[PDB]
Amino acid sequence: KCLAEAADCSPWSGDSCCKPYLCSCIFFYPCSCRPKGW
């Protein structure tokens, strides 16, 4: 199990982002797994 594209990430514990998506924690977008090279 893993977080798909545009999936909210767990603050301390939960599911990990699906590869090769990366959790984006930018300004406009909160911590959420986004595509690789979004």
**CA 18 vs CA 5, 11, 24, 38: distances in Å:** 8, 16, 13, 14
Count up the domains in the chain and report the number. 1
Cα atoms in the 13 Å half-sphere on the side-chain side of 26: 8
Write the DSSP symbol of residue 16. Answer: P
Sheet holding 7-8, edge to edge: 7-8, 32-34, 22-24
Q: Residue 11's domain spans which residues?
A: 1-38
Token pair belonging to 27: 């300004």
Residues sharing a CB contact under 8 Å with residue 11, sequence separation 6 or more, in sequence order: 31
Pair 20, 3: CB distance under 8 Å: no
Residues 18 and 27: their CA atoms lie apart, in Å, by: 22
Q: Residue 22's closest CA among 35, 9, 4, 10?
A: 35
Write the DSSP symbol of residue 25. Answer: -
